[PDB]
Coordinates of C-alpha atoms and ligand atoms in Angstrom, one line a residue:
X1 CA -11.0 -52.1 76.7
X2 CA -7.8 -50.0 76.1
X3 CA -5.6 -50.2 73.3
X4 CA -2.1 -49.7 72.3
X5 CA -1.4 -45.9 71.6
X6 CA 0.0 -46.9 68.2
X7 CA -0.5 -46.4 64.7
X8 CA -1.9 -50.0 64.2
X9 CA -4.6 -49.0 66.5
X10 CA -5.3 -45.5 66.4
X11 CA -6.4 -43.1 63.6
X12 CA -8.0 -44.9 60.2
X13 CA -6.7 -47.9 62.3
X14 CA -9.2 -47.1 65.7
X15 CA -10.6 -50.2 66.1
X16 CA -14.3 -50.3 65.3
X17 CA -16.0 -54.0 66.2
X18 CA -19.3 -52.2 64.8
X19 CA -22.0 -55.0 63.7
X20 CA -25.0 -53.0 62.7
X21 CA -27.7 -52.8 59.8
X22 CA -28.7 -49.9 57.6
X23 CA -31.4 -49.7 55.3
X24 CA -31.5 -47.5 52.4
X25 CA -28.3 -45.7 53.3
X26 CA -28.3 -42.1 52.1
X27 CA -26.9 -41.5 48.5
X28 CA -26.6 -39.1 45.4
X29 CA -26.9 -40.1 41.9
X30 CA -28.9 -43.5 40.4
X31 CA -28.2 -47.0 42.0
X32 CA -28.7 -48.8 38.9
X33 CA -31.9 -50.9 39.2
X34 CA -30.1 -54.0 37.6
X35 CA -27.9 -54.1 40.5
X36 CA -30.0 -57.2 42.2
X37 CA -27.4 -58.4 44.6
X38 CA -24.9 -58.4 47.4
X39 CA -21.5 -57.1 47.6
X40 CA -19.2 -58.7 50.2
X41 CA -15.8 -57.6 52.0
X42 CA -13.9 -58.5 55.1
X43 CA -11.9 -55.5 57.2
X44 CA -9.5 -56.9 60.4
X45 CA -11.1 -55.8 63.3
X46 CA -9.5 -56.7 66.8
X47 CA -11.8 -57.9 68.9
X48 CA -9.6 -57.5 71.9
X49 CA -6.4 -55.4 72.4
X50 CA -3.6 -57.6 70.9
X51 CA -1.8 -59.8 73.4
X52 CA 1.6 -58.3 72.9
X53 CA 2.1 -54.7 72.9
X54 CA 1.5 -54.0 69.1
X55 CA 0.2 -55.6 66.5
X56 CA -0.1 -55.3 62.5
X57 CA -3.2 -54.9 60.2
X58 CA -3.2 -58.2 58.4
X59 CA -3.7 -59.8 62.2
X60 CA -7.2 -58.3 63.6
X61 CA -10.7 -60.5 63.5
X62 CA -12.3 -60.8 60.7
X63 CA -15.2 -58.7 60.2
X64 CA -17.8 -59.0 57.4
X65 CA -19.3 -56.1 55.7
X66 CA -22.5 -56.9 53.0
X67 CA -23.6 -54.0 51.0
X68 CA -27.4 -55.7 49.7
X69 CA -28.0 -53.2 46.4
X70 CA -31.8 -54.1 45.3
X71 CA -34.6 -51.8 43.5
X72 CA -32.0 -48.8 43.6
X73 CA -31.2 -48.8 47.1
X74 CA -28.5 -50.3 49.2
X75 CA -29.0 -52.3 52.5
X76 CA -25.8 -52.4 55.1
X77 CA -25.3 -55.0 57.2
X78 CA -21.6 -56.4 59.5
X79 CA -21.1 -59.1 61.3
X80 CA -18.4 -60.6 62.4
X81 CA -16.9 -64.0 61.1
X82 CA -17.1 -66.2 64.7
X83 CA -14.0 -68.1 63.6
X84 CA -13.0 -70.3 67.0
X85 CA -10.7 -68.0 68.0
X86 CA -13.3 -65.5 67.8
X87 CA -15.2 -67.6 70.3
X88 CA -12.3 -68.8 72.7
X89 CA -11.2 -65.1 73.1
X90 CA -14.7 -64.2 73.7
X91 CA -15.2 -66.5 76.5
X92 CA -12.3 -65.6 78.3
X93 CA -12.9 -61.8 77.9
X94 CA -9.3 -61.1 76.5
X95 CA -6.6 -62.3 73.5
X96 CA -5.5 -65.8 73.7
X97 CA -3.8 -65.6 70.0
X98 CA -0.7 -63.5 69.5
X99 CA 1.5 -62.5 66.4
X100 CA 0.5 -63.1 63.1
X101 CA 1.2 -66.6 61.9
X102 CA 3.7 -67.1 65.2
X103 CA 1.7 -69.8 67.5
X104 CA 5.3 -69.5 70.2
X105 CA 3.2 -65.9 71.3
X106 CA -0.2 -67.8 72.3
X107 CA -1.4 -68.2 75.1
X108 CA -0.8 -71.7 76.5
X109 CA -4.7 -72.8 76.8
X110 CA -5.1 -72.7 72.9
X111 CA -2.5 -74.6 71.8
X112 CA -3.5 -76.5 68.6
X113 CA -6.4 -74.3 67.7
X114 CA -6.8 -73.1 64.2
X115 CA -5.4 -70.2 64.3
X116 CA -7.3 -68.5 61.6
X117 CA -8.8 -64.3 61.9
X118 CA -10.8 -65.5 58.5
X119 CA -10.1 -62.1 57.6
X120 CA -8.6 -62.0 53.8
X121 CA -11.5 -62.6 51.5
X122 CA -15.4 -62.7 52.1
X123 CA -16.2 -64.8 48.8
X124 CA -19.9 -66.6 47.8
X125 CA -19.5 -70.2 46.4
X126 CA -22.1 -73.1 46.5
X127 CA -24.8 -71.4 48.7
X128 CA -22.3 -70.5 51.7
X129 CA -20.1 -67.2 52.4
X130 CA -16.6 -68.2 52.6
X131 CA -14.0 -66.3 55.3
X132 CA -10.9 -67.0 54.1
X133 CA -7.6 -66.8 55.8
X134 CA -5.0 -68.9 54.2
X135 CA -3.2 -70.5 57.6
X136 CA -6.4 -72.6 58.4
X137 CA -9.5 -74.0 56.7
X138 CA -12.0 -71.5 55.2
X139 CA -15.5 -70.4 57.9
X140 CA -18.7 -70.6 56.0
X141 CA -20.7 -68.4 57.5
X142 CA -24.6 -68.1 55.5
X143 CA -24.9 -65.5 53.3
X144 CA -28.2 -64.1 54.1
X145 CA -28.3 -64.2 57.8
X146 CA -25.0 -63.9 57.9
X147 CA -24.4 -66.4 61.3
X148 CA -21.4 -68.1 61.2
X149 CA -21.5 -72.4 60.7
X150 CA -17.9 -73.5 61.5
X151 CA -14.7 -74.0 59.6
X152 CA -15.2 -76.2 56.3
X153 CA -13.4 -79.2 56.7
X154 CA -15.4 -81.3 54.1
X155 CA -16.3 -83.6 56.6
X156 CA -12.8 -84.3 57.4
X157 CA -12.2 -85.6 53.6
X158 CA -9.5 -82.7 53.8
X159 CA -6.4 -83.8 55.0
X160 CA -4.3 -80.4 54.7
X161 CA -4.0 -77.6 57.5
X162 CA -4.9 -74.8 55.3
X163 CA -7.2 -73.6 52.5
X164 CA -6.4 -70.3 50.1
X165 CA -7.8 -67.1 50.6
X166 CA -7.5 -66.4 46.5
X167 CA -10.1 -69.2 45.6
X168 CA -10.9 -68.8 41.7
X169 CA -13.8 -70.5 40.1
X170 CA -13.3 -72.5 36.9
X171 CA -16.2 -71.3 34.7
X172 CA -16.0 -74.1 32.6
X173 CA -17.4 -76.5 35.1
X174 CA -18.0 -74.3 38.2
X175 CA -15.5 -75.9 40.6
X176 CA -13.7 -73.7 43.0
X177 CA -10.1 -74.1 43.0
X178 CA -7.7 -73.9 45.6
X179 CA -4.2 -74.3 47.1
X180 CA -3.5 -74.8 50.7
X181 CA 0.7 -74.1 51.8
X182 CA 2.2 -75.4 54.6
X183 CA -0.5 -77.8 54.0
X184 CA 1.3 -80.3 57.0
X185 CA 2.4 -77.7 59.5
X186 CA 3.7 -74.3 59.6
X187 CA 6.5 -73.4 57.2
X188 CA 6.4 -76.4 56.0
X189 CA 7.1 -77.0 52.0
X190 CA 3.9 -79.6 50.9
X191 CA 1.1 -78.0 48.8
X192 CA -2.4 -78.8 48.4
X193 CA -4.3 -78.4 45.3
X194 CA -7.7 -78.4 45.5
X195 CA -11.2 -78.7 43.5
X196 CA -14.6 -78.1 45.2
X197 CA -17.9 -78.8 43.5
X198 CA -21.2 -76.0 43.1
X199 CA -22.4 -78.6 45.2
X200 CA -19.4 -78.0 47.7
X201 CA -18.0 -81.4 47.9
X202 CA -14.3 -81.8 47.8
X203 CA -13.6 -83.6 44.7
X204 CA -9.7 -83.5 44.5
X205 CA -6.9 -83.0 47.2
X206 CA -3.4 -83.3 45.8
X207 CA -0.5 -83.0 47.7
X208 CA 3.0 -81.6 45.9
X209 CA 6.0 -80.3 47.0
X210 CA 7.1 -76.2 46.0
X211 CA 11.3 -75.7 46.1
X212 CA 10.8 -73.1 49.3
X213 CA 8.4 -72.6 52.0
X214 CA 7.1 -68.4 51.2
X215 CA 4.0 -66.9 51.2
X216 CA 1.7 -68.9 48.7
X217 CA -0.9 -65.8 49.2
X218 CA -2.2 -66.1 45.4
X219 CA -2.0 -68.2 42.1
X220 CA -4.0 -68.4 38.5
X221 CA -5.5 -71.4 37.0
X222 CA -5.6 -71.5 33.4
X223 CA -8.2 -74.4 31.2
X224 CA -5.8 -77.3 32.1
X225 CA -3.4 -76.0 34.8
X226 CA -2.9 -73.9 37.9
X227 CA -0.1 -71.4 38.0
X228 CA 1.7 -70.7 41.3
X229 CA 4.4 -68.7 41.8
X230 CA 7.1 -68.8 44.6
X231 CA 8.1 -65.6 45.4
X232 CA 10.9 -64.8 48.3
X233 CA 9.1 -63.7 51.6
X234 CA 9.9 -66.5 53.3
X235 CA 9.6 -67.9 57.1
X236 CA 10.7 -70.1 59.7
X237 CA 10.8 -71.6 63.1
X238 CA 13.9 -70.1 63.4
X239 CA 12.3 -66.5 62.6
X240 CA 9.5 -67.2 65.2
X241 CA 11.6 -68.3 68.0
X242 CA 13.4 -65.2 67.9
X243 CA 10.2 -63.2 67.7
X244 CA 10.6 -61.9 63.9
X245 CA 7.8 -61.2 62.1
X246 CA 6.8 -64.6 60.3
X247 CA 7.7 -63.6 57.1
X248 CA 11.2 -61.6 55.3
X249 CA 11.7 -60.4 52.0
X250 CA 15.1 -62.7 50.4
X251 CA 16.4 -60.6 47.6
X252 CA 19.2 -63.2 46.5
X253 CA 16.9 -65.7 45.7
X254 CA 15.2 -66.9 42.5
X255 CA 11.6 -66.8 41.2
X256 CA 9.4 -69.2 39.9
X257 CA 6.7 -70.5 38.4
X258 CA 5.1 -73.7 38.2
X259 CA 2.5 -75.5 36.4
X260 CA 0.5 -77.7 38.1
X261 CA -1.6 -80.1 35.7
X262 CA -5.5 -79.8 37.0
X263 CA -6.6 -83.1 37.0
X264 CA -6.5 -86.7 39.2
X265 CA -3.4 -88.2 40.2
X266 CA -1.2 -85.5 39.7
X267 CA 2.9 -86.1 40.5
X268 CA 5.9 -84.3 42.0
X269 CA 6.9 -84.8 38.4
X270 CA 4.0 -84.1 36.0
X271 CA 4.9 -80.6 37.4
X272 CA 6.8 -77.9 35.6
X273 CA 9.0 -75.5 37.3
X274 CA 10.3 -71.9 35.3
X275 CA 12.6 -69.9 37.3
X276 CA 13.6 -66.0 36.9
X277 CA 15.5 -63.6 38.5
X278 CA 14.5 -61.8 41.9
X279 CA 11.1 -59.5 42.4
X280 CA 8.0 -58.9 43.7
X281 CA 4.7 -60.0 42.7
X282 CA 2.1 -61.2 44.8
X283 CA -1.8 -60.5 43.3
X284 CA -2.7 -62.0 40.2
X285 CA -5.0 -60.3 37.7
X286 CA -5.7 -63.8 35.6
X287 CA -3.8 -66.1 33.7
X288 CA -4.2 -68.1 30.3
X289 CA -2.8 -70.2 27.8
X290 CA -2.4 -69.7 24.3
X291 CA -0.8 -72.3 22.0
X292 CA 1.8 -73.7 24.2
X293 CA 2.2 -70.6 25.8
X294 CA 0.7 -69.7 29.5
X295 CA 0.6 -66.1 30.0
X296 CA 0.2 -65.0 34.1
X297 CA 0.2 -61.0 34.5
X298 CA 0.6 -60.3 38.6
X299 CA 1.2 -57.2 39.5
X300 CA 5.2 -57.1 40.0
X301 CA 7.5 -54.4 41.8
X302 CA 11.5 -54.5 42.0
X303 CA 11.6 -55.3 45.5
X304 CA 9.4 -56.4 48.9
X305 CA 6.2 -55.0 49.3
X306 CA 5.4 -55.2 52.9
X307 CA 7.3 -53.7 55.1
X308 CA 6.3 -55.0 58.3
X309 CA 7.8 -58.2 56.6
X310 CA 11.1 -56.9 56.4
X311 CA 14.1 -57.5 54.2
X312 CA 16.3 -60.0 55.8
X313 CA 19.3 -58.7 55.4
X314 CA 18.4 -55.8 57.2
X315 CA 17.8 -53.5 54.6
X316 CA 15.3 -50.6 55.3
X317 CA 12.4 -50.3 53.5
X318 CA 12.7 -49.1 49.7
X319 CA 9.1 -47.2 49.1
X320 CA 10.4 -46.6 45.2
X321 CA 10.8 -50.4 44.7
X322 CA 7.9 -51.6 46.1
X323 CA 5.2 -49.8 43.4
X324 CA 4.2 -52.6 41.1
X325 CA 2.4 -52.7 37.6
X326 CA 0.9 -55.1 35.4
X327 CA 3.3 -57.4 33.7
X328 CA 2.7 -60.6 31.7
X329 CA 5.0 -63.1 33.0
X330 CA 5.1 -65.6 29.9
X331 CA 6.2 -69.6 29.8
X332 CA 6.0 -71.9 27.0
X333 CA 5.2 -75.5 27.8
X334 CA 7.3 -76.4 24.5
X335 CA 10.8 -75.2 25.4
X336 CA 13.4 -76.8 27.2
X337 CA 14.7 -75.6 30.5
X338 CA 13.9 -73.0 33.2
X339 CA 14.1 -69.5 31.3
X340 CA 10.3 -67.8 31.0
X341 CA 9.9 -67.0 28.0
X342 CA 8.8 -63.5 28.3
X343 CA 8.4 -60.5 31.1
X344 CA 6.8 -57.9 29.9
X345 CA 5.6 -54.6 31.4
X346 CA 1.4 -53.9 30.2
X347 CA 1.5 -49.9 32.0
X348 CA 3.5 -47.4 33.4
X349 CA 1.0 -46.4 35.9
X350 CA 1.7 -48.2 39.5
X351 CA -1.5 -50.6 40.4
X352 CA -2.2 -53.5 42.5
X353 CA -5.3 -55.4 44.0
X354 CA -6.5 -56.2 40.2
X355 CA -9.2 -58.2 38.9
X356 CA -11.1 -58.9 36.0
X357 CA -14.7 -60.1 35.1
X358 CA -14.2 -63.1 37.1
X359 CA -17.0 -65.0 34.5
X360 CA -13.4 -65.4 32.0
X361 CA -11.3 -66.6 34.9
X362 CA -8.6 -68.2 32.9
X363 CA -9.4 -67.4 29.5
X364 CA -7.5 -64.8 27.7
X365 CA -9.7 -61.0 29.5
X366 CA -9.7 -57.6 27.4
X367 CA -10.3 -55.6 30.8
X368 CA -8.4 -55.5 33.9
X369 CA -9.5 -52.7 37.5
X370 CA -6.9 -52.0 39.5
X371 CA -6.3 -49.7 42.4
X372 CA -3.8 -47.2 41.6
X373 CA -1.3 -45.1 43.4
X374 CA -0.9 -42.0 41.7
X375 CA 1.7 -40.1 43.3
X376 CA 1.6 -36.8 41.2
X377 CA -1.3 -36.0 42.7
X378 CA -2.4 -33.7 45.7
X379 CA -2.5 -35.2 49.1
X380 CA -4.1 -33.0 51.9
X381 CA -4.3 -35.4 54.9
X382 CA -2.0 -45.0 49.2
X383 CA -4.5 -46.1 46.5
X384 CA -6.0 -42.6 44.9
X385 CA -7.1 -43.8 41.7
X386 CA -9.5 -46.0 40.2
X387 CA -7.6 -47.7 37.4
X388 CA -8.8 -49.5 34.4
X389 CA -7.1 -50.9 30.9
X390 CA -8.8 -52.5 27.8
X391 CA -5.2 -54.2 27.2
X392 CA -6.8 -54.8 23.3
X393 CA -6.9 -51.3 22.8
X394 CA -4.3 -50.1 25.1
X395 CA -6.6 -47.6 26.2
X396 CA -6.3 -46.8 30.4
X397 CA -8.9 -45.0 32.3
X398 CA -8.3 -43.1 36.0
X399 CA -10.4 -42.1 38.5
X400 CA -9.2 -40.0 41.4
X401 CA -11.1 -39.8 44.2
X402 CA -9.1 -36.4 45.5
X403 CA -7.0 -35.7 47.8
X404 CA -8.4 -36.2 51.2
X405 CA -9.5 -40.1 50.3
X406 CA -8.3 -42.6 49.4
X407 CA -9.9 -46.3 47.9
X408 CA -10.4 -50.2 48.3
X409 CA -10.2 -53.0 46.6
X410 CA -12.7 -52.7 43.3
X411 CA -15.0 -55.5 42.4
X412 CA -17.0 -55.7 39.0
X413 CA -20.3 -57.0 38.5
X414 CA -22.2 -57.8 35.3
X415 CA -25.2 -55.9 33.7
X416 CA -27.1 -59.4 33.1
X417 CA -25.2 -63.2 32.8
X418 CA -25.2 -62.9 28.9
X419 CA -23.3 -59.2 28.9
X420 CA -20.1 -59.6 27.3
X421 CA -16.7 -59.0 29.0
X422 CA -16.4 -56.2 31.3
X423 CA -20.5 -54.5 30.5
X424 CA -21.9 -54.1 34.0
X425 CA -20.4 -52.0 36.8
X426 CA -17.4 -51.3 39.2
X427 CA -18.1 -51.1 43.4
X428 CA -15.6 -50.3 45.8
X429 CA -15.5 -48.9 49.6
X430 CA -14.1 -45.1 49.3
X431 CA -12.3 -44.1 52.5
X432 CA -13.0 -40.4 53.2
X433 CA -10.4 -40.0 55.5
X434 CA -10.6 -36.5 56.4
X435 CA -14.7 -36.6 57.2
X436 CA -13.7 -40.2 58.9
X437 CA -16.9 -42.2 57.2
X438 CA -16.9 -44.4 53.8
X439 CA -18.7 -44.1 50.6
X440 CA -19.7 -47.3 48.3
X441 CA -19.2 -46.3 45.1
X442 CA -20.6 -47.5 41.7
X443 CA -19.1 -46.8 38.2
X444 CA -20.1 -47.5 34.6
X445 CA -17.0 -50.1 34.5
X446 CA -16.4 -48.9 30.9
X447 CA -16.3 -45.7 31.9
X448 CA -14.9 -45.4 34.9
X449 CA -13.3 -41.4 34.0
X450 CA -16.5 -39.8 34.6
X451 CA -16.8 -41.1 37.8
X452 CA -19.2 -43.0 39.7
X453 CA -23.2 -43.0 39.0
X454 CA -23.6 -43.0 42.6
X455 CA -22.2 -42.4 45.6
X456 CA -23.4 -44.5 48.9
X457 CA -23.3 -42.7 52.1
X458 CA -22.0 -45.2 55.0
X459 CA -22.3 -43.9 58.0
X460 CA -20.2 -46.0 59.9
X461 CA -16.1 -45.1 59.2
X462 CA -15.1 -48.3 57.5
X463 CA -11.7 -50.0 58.2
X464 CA -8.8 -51.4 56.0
X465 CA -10.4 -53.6 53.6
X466 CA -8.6 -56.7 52.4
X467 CA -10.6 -58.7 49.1
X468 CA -14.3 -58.8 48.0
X469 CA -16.7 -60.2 46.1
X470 CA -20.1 -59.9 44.4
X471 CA -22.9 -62.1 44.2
X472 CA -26.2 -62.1 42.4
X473 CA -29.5 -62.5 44.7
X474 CA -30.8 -65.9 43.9
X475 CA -27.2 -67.0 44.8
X476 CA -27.1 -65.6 48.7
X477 CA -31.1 -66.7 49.5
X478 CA -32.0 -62.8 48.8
X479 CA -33.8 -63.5 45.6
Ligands
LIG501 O1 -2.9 -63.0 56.2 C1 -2.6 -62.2 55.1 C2 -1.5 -62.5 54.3 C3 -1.2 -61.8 53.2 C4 -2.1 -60.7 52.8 C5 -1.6 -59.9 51.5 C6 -2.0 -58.6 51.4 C7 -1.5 -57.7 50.2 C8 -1.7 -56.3 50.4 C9 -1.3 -55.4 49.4 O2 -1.5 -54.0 49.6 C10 -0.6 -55.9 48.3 C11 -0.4 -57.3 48.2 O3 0.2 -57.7 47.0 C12 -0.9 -58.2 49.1 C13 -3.2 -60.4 53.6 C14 -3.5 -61.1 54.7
LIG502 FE1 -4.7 -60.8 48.5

């Protein structure tokens, strides 16, 4: 097939469409023998050159990457996630689908298909692999054989469009929980929240109302609420029609927060809006309450982040205020009126795709990983460093991984299911960009400074990685 000559598709962006399987990749160091697992993560992939003459990175097929880490060695194996656009395209030999979320570029013959690249997240919950792409219902695909089943509809018992790809798991009772925007079409204002069982049955669907449509990409639950905040990249028919990209950063308009009561029969007004000026913020590290106080630290910059989502004013792209850092954003359920009641900077060092030890999701978390742009270091060809912070001490950790590299999204895992908070490790893809090929690397994730314990040979170049996840053996039918 032949591809556009541009930089979405050439260079770290060649497409790749590799499904394979390694066993006991190459490697120096020790692979911890507790590892006893699988870590999973999802890169867009086009399966086909794009219909129109260029595409972005967010829009390629989803394809799954599993790195199985057992008895000190590491297994590889990709496939890709056969979402039904995966299959329609593949019949006809050629893109049917065009821009990203802009259904006025497909081809006639798939009008009304889900629309979905499952390409966001590659998360384990209640015996199935979710691939997650939040226009469309989740694919569960199985976790061992990784085959692909269908999207996950709940047997139609769901009666929104769209399912997050930011799922969180409630540790207290081991539901999943979930949003789904423009829940009733696209750009649309209605909300779904959503609770799914271990057993995966969908146990609560409730619709609500947010003041704008925007990109709904994340959220944090807390013990008795979920937190979403509406943030100003915003879309429309309007932008479609014309052939904009489906979403534009709105600096004029306001920020907010609102708190979403998790339980049954949940009202427009049993929810609570707060509303700050204009930023940025899109991942979430966690969120928790504390006396009448919710605390929700994102990772927030001055201004847009994605520039292939422009500012709609027609501003050009401001590199400066788009680096973000960890900042509490802080409400209290006992005041009166709209003002948070707190925004406060945790670092100076820029950091996004964060995340915690995901067994204290929604509890108050000493530890937060991060990947880090350190731009006071060398660069001989960006996320550079391997970030952590023990926000009780203050203390911060970096790793740079030099300065012909550069890094993916990190993901912890526990020593054993009794370790406290933060003891186990850290895993994340390492893009050596110069030598074109990928490392997996594992760190101490206490002490990330002294760099990983092993490095993972992959011999296959690895693309742009979006989110990940890890899950122990007896959980993926590996045990
Ligand atoms: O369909 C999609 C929609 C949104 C996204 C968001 C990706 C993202 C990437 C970053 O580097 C920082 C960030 O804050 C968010 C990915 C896929
Ligand atoms: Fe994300």
């Amino acid at each position: 097939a032949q591809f556009p000559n541009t930089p979405s598709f050439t260079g770290f962006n060649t497409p790749s469409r590799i499904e394979a399987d390694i066993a006991d990749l190459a490697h120096e160091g020790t692979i911890p023998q507790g590892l006893n697992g699988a870590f999973y993560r999802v890169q867009p992939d086009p399966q086909f050159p794009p219909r129109l003459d260029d595409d972005i990175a967010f829009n390629g097929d989803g394809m799954i990457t599993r790195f199985h880490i057992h008895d000190g060695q590491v297994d590889f194996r990709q496939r890709w996630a056969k979402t039904d656009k995966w299959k329609l395209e593949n019949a006809a030999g050629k893109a049917l689908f065009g821009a990203y979320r802009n259904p006025l570029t497909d081809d006639e013959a798939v009008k009304g298909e889900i629309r979905s690249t499952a390409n966001t997240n590659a998360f384990v919950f209640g015996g199935k692999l979710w691939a997650m792409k939040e226009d469309s219902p989740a694919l569960v695909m199985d976790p061992a054989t990784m085959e692909t089943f269908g999207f996950e509809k709940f047997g139609g018992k769901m009666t929104g469009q769209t399912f997050t790809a930011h799922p969180k798991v409630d540790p207290k009772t081991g539901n999943m929980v979930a949003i789904g925007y423009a829940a009733s079409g696209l750009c649309t204002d209605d909300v779904t929240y959503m609770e799914v069982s271990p057993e995966g049955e969908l146990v609560r669907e409730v619709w609500f109302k947010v003041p704008y449509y925007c990109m709904m990409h994340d959220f944090g639950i807390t013990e008795d609420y979920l937190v979403l905040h509406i943030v100003p990249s915003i879309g429309s028919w309007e932008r479609l029609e014309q052939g904009k990209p489906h979403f534009g950063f709105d600096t004029t308009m306001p920020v907010h927060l609102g708190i979403i009561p998790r339980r049954d029969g949940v009202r427009q007004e049993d929810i609570r809006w707060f509303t700050r000026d204009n930023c940025f913020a899109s991942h979430v590290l966690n969120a928790w309450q504390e006396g009448t106080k919710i605390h929700f630290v994102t990772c927030e910059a001055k201004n847009n982040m994605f520039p292939f989502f422009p500012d709609v004013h027609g501003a050009p792209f401001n590199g400066m205020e788009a680096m973000s850092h960890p900042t509490d954003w802080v409400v209290d359920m006992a005041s009166n009126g709209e003002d948070f009641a707190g925004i406060v900077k945790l670092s100076d060092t820029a950091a996004e795709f964060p995340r915690i030890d995901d067994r204290f999701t929604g509890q108050k978390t000493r530890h937060g990983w991060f990947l880090e742009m350190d731009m006071k270091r060398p660069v001989e060809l960006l996320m550079n460093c391997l970030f952590h912070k023990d926000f009780e001490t203050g203390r911060e950790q970096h790793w740079w991984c030099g300065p012909v590299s550069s890094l993916q999204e990190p993901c912890f895992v526990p020593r054993a299911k009794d370790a406290p908070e933060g003891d186990g490790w850290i895993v994340q893809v390492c893009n050596r960009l110069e030598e074109q090929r990928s490392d997996l690397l594992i760190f101490d994730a206490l002490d990330i400074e002294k760099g990983p314990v092993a490095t993972v040979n992959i011999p296959i170049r690895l693309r742009f990685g979006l989110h990940g996840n890890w899950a122990n053996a007896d959980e993926i039918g590996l045990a």
